[PDB]
Structure formats: C-alpha cells, structure tokens
C-alpha cells in the first residue's frame, strides 16, 4: 500500500487512524464499478456473513446468496440440519424471493409471528398451491386471537407468471396499495413474490451461484474431533465453502487440522483463522489453507482485549497479512468488528479480498432470532441470547458434570447484547444497499472500476485523535 | 508557511493540531487592520456564505453584501427567482436596511411571523409609502389573533431624512424607548430603517459593491446539463460570481464544464471545487478556474468520512492547495466545517484568500428558514429541513419513477439537524462582528495590517491531543 | 523484551500503548500452562494481595494461600494480632475451607452478619463440635430478630469424612438443594465444608505451602523505628515473607533499613519498594533486597500524579526495572493499579515475576470490610473507610496533639471510594479464576507453557490513542 | 531542562504531556525544603495572586503577604484606594491576623455578613478598643434580625498579650470551645486574633516583608495613558512591585511603555507580559523589564483559543521563555490557568521563578466577592460578576456613547463563572497549605532542598493521551 | 442502656436507639465509666471494643437528690444526662431535665 510522504507513524493504525485522499477519477457513476471478488469464493460482493447461530440463518443464507454474498453455517449444527438448509437454499429461485406461506385453519398469532420473519411485510395464504390473499400489517390488530387465517384475508394482490421482466412487474405496482407482486408458475401454482425494491435489486445485483446454477452457501467446522469426517460430510452435503475457525488460529492443532482436511483433496477452497501476523498467515497458507482469516481482538475496549492483553489494531494487521499472502498467492478476510461501511471500505483498500460482517446483521428481520419490543415498543433482538445453548449442546461432548463445570468455571459468560431494529433498514437488503453504496462511493472517489484497481491506486494518510474532540 | 524548529510531524494537521505563536507587533488596535481580499471577488471581508437553500436567502444576500461579504445563490433556483433576487439586492441602499413592511388590514399573525424575519425587532406599518408606526415585541401578546394591523400601532418612532450622518442618528436614539430610526426620502416616503449598532457597523464596515455602486451577489450552477447556457443566463441576470460545485471536483466532467464556461469568456471570475490536492488544484486552474474551492470531508466523524474512507484534514489540504495555487497565480477558498472564528483565522493564516461559512449561519433570524420554539421555547431552525425538497425538485429531471427510485435508493437521506438560535447573536450581524473581531485579534497578535502580511509573517506550531483531556 | 520492527516510540508506554501479537503455539488448552513463579516466594500463581487494612484480612490470607497465592499483612497491626492470624492460617486444611460457625443461643442478626462474611452462602450450626444444620439465604427474612439460632435450622446437609476424593463429593452434590458438603473428622467432629466449584478449584489449583506443609503468609513492616526488632518479631511469629514499603523507596532511610534487616540474616526473602528506575532497583538490590517493588504513581490522573508531577507509566518502568534486576539476579513486582487481567498479563510479559492486586479485592465478601447496601440494595464496601483510623493509631507515636496536627495539616485525606460488589464474582475465588483464565489465555495465545517461556517469546507492538475514540 | 532518552516529541507539550521521574533523594521530610524565590520579588513562596478585581482584595493582600506571597492590585482602582490599601497592609502585624470588628448598636444582619468575610469564623465585639465577646456561627439563627450586636455576645474568649510564644497560645486552646485566641496590647486594647492552625502556619511560614519590616504588596498599571505618571504615583504610594499587563505583551506600545517606566529609574523590579516566545521575552527584557510574564491562551478549549487560533501549550512556552531569560539574567512567571498544585510544580520545574494563581482563589472567604448560597445552600461566588463594571468604569475614558458602543460591539462579554466554595478549604490559607504541600512533596520526590536545585536536577518524561481513557 | 467492656461497637449503636436517653452508659464492676452518645460510632472502626471512644465527662450525683438541683447541674452540661449512683458508688440509673 502507498502512504503520503512523511506519514511513517511509530504505532499500529486502526480504522480511525487512516483516511483516503481523493485521486484523479474517470468513473462516471457508482454503477460503473464491479465489486466481484477474485479470492475464488464466487461472490460478486465483498460481504460475508459470520458463522454465529444468531446470524447464520436459513433466510440469511437464501437472501445473501441471492444478493451476491455468502453465508457460513454454524459448526455446532447437526449434519441433517445443514443438509436440509443446503437443499432448501439450492432449491430457491434466482430472482423471486420465497414468501411467508400460511396454511388455512392456522392460528392468527402464528401468522403475526411469521409476518415479521421477513422484510416483505405480507404473508401469502396458500391452499392447494394457489394464493388466496395477503396478510399485511394491522390486519391482526383487534381481530380475535383465535382467528383461522381464512377470515381477514385481502384478495387484492397483483399476480403475474414467473419469467416476467421486472420492469413491467415494477410498472404494475405503481398504483398498487400493497407493494407485493405474486409470481406464479404457468400451471397457476404459487412460486414466489417480488417487490419494487426487490425487482430493482435483482436487476442491479448478481446472485452468487455454483456451476449448477444454484445459490451458493458456506459452512464451518470445529477444531475438535475428526475434522476430516466432518469436512467429508459437509462436502457430500453440498457445501461450497469450508471454514475452520477458533480463537487462536496460529496453533499446532489448527495446522494438523488443516493438513488433515487438505489430505482429502476435496478441491474446495478452505478458510482458516484467525491470525494477525505475517508468520501466522504464511504458516496457515503452507499448511494447506487457501484463504486466511484476519482479526483477533481488534477493539481497544473489547472483551478479548479486556480479559487479556492480546490483540492488534485491525488495519495494520490486515495490511501485513495481505502483504504476506499476496506473495504466496493467498487471500485474506477481515473478521473484525464492522459497524459502518467505512470499515469495509478501509479493509478492502488495505488488500483484503472479503470483509465479514458479524453482529451488525443480527438486528434484522431475516435473522433467526425472534423480534420483541421494549417498553417504548422498540424492535430489538437479543444477540447471543441463544448462542450459549447451542455452544453447550456440543461442548458437553458426553463428558460428566464434573468436567463440564471444570471447563465452564474458567469460561466467561458472554452477555446478551440487545440490538435495536433500525426502522428504515429492518431488512438485510437495506443494509446491503447501504454497504454497497458506501463501497461504490469509495471506488468512485479513488477512481477505480474494480477492487484490485482500488487496492492498486489507493493512497492513504494518517490523522491524529485530536480531530475526535 | 513557516513552522517552528523541529516541528515536522509524520501526519496531516487539523485545526486542533496547530497554534499561532505571537510575534513582534506594531498594530495599535483592532481597527488598524485591513481585511480586504485580493482574490478578485471584491469582498472587504473574508466571509462567504455557502450556496445551500437553508442559508442562501434574499435577506442573507442583502445583509452580507451590505456588511462587505458575498452570498452564493443555490443552483436549483429557477432563473426568474435568481433574477428577481439579484434585482432586489441591487435595488437596496448602501447604508440603511430594508425594514419589515406591513400593509393595513393584514392579519396580526402575519405581522408576528414577519417580525422575527429580521433582527431589527420592529416592523414598520406603511400606507401610501408613509410610516404610521412600529410593531415591536409583546405587541401581539393577548391581542386578538384577527387584528387588522392598524389597532396596536405605536406612532412614537424617530424619523429623519436619508443622508443624515449616522453619528447624529445615534445621538437621537440615546433616550429613545425603541432602538429604531426611520429613514425617509425627502418627499416623505418610507426608505428604510437604522439602529445604533447598525449605524456603527455602517461606519466601520465597507459594503462590497460592483462598478455600478450596487451590492454584489454570487450564484452557483450544477454540473449537469448545458452549463454554458446556465452560465450565460446568470451572467445576463446580473450575477457577479459563478460557482460550479460538486462532491468531487477533481473529475473529468468538471474539467469539461470549466472549459465550456471559460469558452464563453464572460470575464467574471469562476469558482470551482472541491479538491484537497495540489494536482487537483493545478488541473482546475489549468481548465479555466480562477478560484479553487478546498475541503472534502474535513471532519474525522463527519457523514462523508463515515460513509466512506475518503477525506483529508482541512489545514494540511488548504496549505497544500494554497502553495500550489499561488505559484500558478490562483486563489483557494476554505469550504470546510466552520463553527468558531478560530477556524477562519487558521484558514486565512494557511494561505486561503476567503473562508466560506455553511450551517453556522442557518441559526439566524435573517435565514430563510422559519423560526420555531421547543418545549422550553428554545428558538431553533431545522437545518436541511426543506433542502431535500429543493434538491429533488431538480433531481427528477423529468425521469420516470423507476429511475428516480433507482437513484434515491443509493442516496443517503440527510438528517434534519436542529440549530438553536443564540439569544445574544440572533442576527447575522452579531456573528459577523464576532468573526471579524476574532480575525482582527489574530492579526494584532501576529502583528499584521492586512491578510497578505498575516500570511507572510505567520509562524505556526504543533501541539498534541493530550491537552484536550 | 522484543518489539516489532520500527516500533521505537519517543515516549514511555502504558498498558494502553502495547499489545501482544500472536505467535506459533503448540499449547493444546489453558490447563497445559504452569503458572508457578521463580522469584522464591513459593507461590504457584502470580497473584499477590496488597498490604492494606481494607484487603489484607485473615479470611483473605487463608483463601489466597489455599488457592496458591500469598497475602502481606498490614504493618500497623500489633504483634499479637499478626501472631494469632499466622497461627490460624497455619492451622487450616489444605483442601476444605473453614465455614462460618454459629454457637447455639446466639442472635439471628449476628448469624445474618456472619453469613455474608464468606462466599459459601451457608453458615453451619455447631454444638459439641457436631454440625446441626446450615443457615442459608432468606432464612432470616421474616423470622424474629431475636431468634436463638436453633429455631430455623435446616438439618438436610450432606456429610462426608475428610479425605474423600472431591470427585465423589461433587457427585453427591449433583441433586442437593444446597451446594454445601460438610466434611467431618473420623470421630464425627466438624472439620470444614466443600463446594462443587471449591472442589474443582482444589483439584485444579495448588496451595502455596512452606516446608512444614502449612499455608504461607506474608507481613509488612514500616520504615520508622527499630526495623530490625520488628523483623525479628515477625520472623519468630512465623512469617514467610517480609515487605518494607513506603511512598518513595529510593531513599537513604530505606537503604539503612534494608541493611539493618539484612544484617540479621534471617534467611527469608525480602521485598522492598517502590522504585521505577534502574538505578533505584540496583541500589535496592545492592542494599540487601531480594525482590524489588515497582510502581509509583502509575496513573495519569491518580492522586499521586495530581498532587505532584512525580510518576512514570507502569509498563516502561516495569520493563526497565526487570531488565536491571535480571542481570543482578533479582526479581521485580508490579505494584500499580490493577483492574483487569490484561494488566496482570502485560506485567508478566514485561518481565515481572509477580503482580500485586490492590483495591480490586476490596469489593469481595471475604474482605474484612462489612457489607452494606445502597438505596437500590447494591452491595458495596467502603474502601479506605477504616484504613485512616489504623494509620493514625500508629501515626500518633505518643507525640503531643501539636505534633500530630502539624503532621496532619500537610497530609491529604484519602477519600472513601465505594466499591460495588459484583453479584457474579462476589467471592475472591471467582476473581482468581477470572485472572488465571486471562493469564492462561495469554500464554496459549503466545504459545508458552510457563511464565519464563512467556517472557522469552513475547513480541509486543505499539498502538496509538485514536483506537480509543 | 533534561528529558529521558529518546523522548523528543514532534509537538509542544502541555501539563498533561509531562511527568517527573523520581531520582536519588536525601531530603528527610517536607520541612527540609526552602521555597524562597530568587527573582527579586522578596516572596518566600512561589505563589502570586492575579491582579483581577474579583481576587485582588485587601484581605487577600494582607493574608497572602503574611503567609509569604504577594498580591498585585487591579490597575483600574483609583490612586486613593490603592494608597489606602497599601497603608492598611503595611499597618498590619507580622503574626496576628486582623479580626472582624463589630461596633455596638449595629445590625445583626451586618454582623452575619461580616462573619463570612474571613476564615476565623468569629467576629469580635469591640468597644473603646476592648474586646467584649465573639459572635460565632448559629448565633444569628432564630435571633431577631434587628438585634443590636450587644444582645447575643458570648464573653468566653481566651485573652493573651501580644508577643506570647504561639506554642503556649496553642496550649491554651486545647480545650477551648471556640478556636479563637484574642491577642491584646499591653494597655488592654484589642490588637488581633490567633488560631491553632494560624499559629502553626505563623511558626512554619515566613512573611514577605520589605526593608521596613512591613508586609509587601504589588500593583498593576494599564498600557493606556501616561504610564510614567501612574508608575510614579504608585511608587510614591508605597507599592513594592509594578506589573504592566495586557492581552498581547509583544507589541510596540508595551515596548514604549516599558521604556517610559524604566526611564524614571524608580529602582523597583518591573513585570511585563504576556509573551510565549523567546523573541518576545528577549525584546521585553531589552526594553527594560526585569520579570517577563508567560502564558497567552494556554488551554485548548479556552475562550482565547476558541475566539481565535492564537495560543501555545503552557509547558513548552514556559520552558522556552525561561531558557531565553536565564541567559539574559531575567526571570519568567507562569500566568496560565492553575487549578491543581501539579501545574505549579510543573511550572517551577520548567524554570519559572514564580507561579501566578488566578480564578482558583476567587472561591474563598477572604475574596472581596460576597458569599451566596444555591438552592442546596452551596456556598459559591460569582467570578467576573462585578469585574466588568470596574473594567467599564475606566474603559469609558470620558468618550461619548457612540465610541463606547463602537468599542463594545467587538468586545466579547465575559460570562459569570460560578465558583463553589470548598467546605474543607474555605479560607485561602488552606489552599496555601495544599499548594505548598504539593510543591514540597515534588521537591522531596526529586531530591532538592530549594527551587534552583529542583530546576537543576529535574528529569522529565513524556506520556501519551491513551492513559486518560 | 448499659454496655459491658470488650463488646462490639455495632451492638452499642443498636442499643443506643433502644431508648430516648440518647446516651448509653459504660459500666464495669457496677461503676459508670462514660457515656456513648450520637456520632460517636461514625467513622470509628466497626470492631471497636466499647472502651475506645468513651467520653468520661458525665455529671454524677447520689440517688435521692431533689430533681430541682439535678436540673440545675445540667444547665450548662454538654450532654443532657445525669448519672444517679447508689451511696456505695454503684450505678443505679440516669436522669434528664425533661425526665
């Protein structure tokens, strides 16, 4: 990377220590920028969803795969659940989105619960495969809590066959009172739904698909037990990406696990982490890892850097890891704490081929967590509220209570961090547009048409903390 | 610029990183300093009003032109409105200020609304061109809301002919209960008003006037469409300054627009921006721009530097741009975030020939925004409250709803930043005195009689952030 | 110590200026790390309790000695009290913990007061040496305040003989409603109590014992009076460690006191402080001190560095003192302000053989201070609330009121700092597990099996303050 | 000054950027340090009271002169008032303090008002020069507001002749219910009062006296008008020190004024300021100033550095000014914002021969401002509440209202900063003990017996702002 | 309120509020030693042994004294407690002006 003249600080840099100086640009608009990655993951956007139980949902996988990203499945899920999720994701359409389907004679409370599970805002009633109506907001208000679905249905939905150009689907929704376009198969059976914003996003973005034309998906495996058996099972299940993660990637056990997984020669790219040093990245690449995960305790006041003194600023660590990996022909992923598109832009400018997003996506409708309201009716979701139960479901490993208590005494209980729902960006698609707009604006300011060009021509500067007063 | 010995930091400097060391001075008082600019704009003060709809008003233009500054009109206004504003500004007196005029039989609520539109605090009642009385504060309290103006008038106003020496106008107002001096034409018709502070400011300051002896005014044009046609229309309308602005000035489209405007050879100075690099300033000057606008995302936590990683500290960028421009014979304008006179003083010391003030002037009586009170009756004005509507009035460009939504999805909605009215500095004239006093004190501390001398003899030092604890 | 390439700052470093870069590791888990010290103190953990009256209690000594640490007794205590405390500590069991014993016919209010004096949460009723029942929480609620103990007893406690393997003691407590395991002597007399967490900690940790198989303990002596007589009295009383402390250790009076104590040749290791300079450490070691105490005004806003300008950042001072002492064959102790395990980890990485904890342990049940509740019933303890009285009990020295007032006028009154009880870590054992887990995680991240290896292979980096925004 | 190895920052240092590293010390206690200055002012302590109307009172002059300091009188006072104050100060005793005297038949409300004017807490009733009783706190509570003084008197005061050794005066007050010792002349007339703390302070401190054995005092003069005439009048009035102050000392007008004052050759030392540059200090010394005043806008958020960008960190400016002045044989005074003894200690270590205290002393009983209570009865005093009236009493200069308004429009109104009374340090003597204790502790930590030795052997280090998190 | 020596100061504070006298007498071998009054336990160590903050400045008179003179002796006393003792010097009771 290139810095300004004389900008040689005596310390490691964070995302608050660096800034991008505008250069000569010929990019006309944001749409003239290609965001496709070159790390071999097949994603058209640098957005990756973290493999935690509170974010990595089935709807998360489907939506992110359709929008061009990828989602890594939690490593504690059973093989049957991962296989079912992979089959469901690879059984989705590349344009239309799967709506919320309500069978007749169901409880209206279940309909209300399912209504908030997606950002469409309308749940379709289906009988014999045929749409009957759309339940929207305020339809359950005042109505009897024991309603049988088929009592408040509103059969005024626009219906069109699948394969219609989304321009005309947008045109039919210009004066519609409900922004839902039901897409049906030629035989009249229900197939999916569309929206004005959804149609525009389908026309702008490009879904990340495999060689079979199906949505891509990723999975993670633990570092304990027979790693080869789990890797083989996930490869047979249809996983397109394997991630072996742990708190400290630069250890002998991870090297042995990487060697064991690479010995099978499954042909799929492998992601390992996390390390924040050039030596660790080189060792991980030599062990057989194609993608190195970067970021260990990036925050100066995070739980990791408060429990221990171990850590490193994210920017310098990512820069060093990318510099070490590019020579060896590898790639690095930023796995820090991302809360603004600025972090993603700076990570991409540093040389990272992908940026992973963690808790930020937990506060969305499509997340597997349930929506609940505060005293002021503030929509929010309990981050890590149920992740501890999934962690201890596999942490027990059939050991006795004495061993479990001995392990858990030293273990620190992760607190339940409330994450408020943003009313203007409730769905993950709004956050995706936000982040992609930030990245595209960064490229236009720099003057690059693609991510390698952005990394090539980026020029950075250093600023002091006195500007934060 | 000259720095202290050994003060060579490894980073770019902001306004919080630099300080002025006092030197040998022979300036007796603040009044012995000339603040006239040499950039060709004709302003006697380095204060420039930003071209946003929430600040660039007609009263703003009149008051700032009378006090020696200049105001740039918004680029989204229609040609008829800009022509009317220019004619009204060039039809004003060089000494007296235009009062609030109330016709008889009008609603008292309209009188109350018009009362707060200017800092005079008294609205004159005019009939057949003759003043009848002055409505002041608390005159509408308790009185019927359907009053017909001519029911609470107070005909106890001091009246003098236009052309009276303001010293005697001040003398007549020594014991007057209302600080309003009605200035009338020799035929007895109403001409304007004066105040003690207004008379003193008229005797101290010098209005910025053109060759015809009329108040100066500036206008802005967008970068889209036929820039030459708009430039010709504004030149024919009587504009004295043209400003072509955009988020990123260092682009090919701005170079083409500058070449197109310069091809007309209208003879007026041209302002373009914004760039924060020497190469950008040189390219803009070569393209045909006489004045270069400086400052792109100056804050470390601003919306621009949070959306993207693009930006630069204002002080270093201004220094570099001024150093590049002075060789080429050009001039630079500071277009950052100004909230204190210290920013203006440091920008002038860096080498900038003019300092532009943005949202700070939005919280004044003369601003086009309407005054409203909080629960504690705090006077405040909604910054950018109505600027979005004016932006989208021209952003539509006759395109269909699909194109407008496609553009606006990536666009980030600017929030409405409340700006509280300062009770002691409600009028823009008080802020003008504040800023001019700060600049004059800076010159006296440095020991310079004019801005070029201030830039010549200024010596700067660098301080750490530990002083901000 | 080894730093990263180019990381040569022009300032001293604190604990917020440094970070540990992960290296190649072969440590399987946290349990594969040995925390035994090599400073000659005999402690299996680097945790040392400060010698202040509000922390250095009898229960503190017993618990910390059983968990592998050591406690330094206050220097103002009379010789009889120190002898009694030493005998009581050396009369304790290496596995079981001494419970709260209630004699019959006592007041229930006394039982409630004694209940919160230890973290067991149940006070055993003993008559003729035989347990009768356990008083637990909410047993005193609503019951008459004049109860005679033997009216609300709950005789449903699991009883086992002393010497039972704690694995089976854990097994018997799997379904018990009260987590208390009464351990009794073979003759049926009461001997102690155990808990699930206590049994696990006894199986993990290793008590620090002397050559006689009894718990170790430390004591402190002042710098005034006949230091040799006090040292001889404490050595005869059974003290295993002598600490001579003062505000400024690098003074001639401390050198004379060290020479006087070393002239007796008691054979015990001696601790002296505090100094933050290599010259001071060398002088203290030459004078006859085997262990040097480090840290004088470590905080930038502490009372010492606000009263005066004297001080030094803890990290650089500890590094320099350790570098000076290791050549001379000595050892250094970190005696700064420790509030997180990160501080202990960084002090150990710097080269310190032991880390002393001060006010942090004051907010625990086992501390000698009494528990009191705020308006919100927040459990808290008044730090330094009664330490002033103990200081002035010996400060009077039989001098007249004039001399006492003359001394105390210049003396600054230490304020009573409230320290809230952490509900999840009320007992000192929870804090001990927290700190040991942090240190073990640090070693696993570095890749070391013991503290000397951790100091040998540690690689550090420097970060700026902009990451704290 | 000497810094640590490698501590060469690229910025100017404030009081938060530096720290004192302890050195080898042989000073037994705080009392073994001499605080006498060598600047020729004759003060035994480095404490100087600023010349503002809200601090520089008559009681301030008397108390500070008795405790060994000096007070500079405001420059706006008339010559008669300054002469009366000087005569009253030079008519005081070197040991006893002047009590609050109440004549008979006075109002009790006046007695209550006068009670809080001094820190004694008891007002003596005097008739024919003989004490009758002492009015103390709560004596006016419930008593009639129209009491005639001689109705609630408490004639139980200890009386001793003047010249008694304060040791025995302390002894008589051991069991007295009121800590007041009335000192009377041999003829029985009232002469003064004493207190236990006052007697101890008289035995510790040394009053600053002239060649006639009378308390010293200082005065200030403005830079406008005939400076020589005012200097001659103040010299004839008995002033021991002349201070010519202004916002910017490094100006030609101050050079001319200094030359004019030095032409008279009054023989008294002259103080001038303020400058923060070596060139300014050299010019001021060459012009005829023996003492240079240092400090112009020291704070990073002060009113001076918010109005303008002019300023400099205090520490670096003081260091440079002292280095420039010592060669020329001059001396420098720190005139920044002092709120802690740390500032005074660091200024003395930098090389300053005296430290001036400003608003900190405004919040005391002896200050000329009146005591008033908040809603919570918090004792506080309005700083700069009445200083504006005294400033405009001489600012008018007989000019017309037009000129006064023209000057005051640009002038910024200083706000009234409430200063709460510290209950434990209400009197200025408590603050004096606090500051002297801080300075003596600094010297003991450094290991110096006097201020020149402290400046000689001081070794400083630099710390970052990350320690302030 | 009678306090034996070597007792806890917390017990003394609890017993202080058990009666309206406001002062608890310290008794040893039947002889008064001092009176513990309000604010005597504030700031003092919670493990005080009674005989560390005693204030031996109590007015003492034999039982049977006319209460008019007992009132007279308490006119300027700082503590409104009049210790009434038996002729042999043993503690018998207390009195107050209002009492």
Curated annotation (Swiss-Prot), chain E:
Lineage, top-rank taxon, reads Bacteria
**Which residues belong to any copy of the CBS domain?**
1-53, 54-99
Location of this fragment in the whole protein:
100 to 198 of 478
- Where is the secretion signal located? none
Which organism is this protein's natural source? Mycolicibacterium smegmatis (strain ATCC 700084 / mc(2)155)
Gene null: resulting phenotype: Knocked out mutant does not require any purine supplement for the growth and does not exhibit any growth defects in media containing hypoxanthine, guanine and adenine.
Entry's family note? Belongs to the IMPDH/GMPR family. GuaB1 subfamily.
- What does the organism's lineage look like at the top? Bacteria, Bacillati, Actinomycetota, Actinomycetes, Mycobacteriales
UniProt protein name: GMP reductase
Assembly and oligomerization: Homooctamer composed of two tetramers. The oligomerization state is regulated by ligands and pH.
Q: What does this protein do?
A: Involved in the purine-salvage pathway. Catalyzes the NADPH-dependent conversion of GMP to IMP. Is not essential for viability, but may contribute to the regulation of the purine nucleotide pool by recycling GMP to IMP.
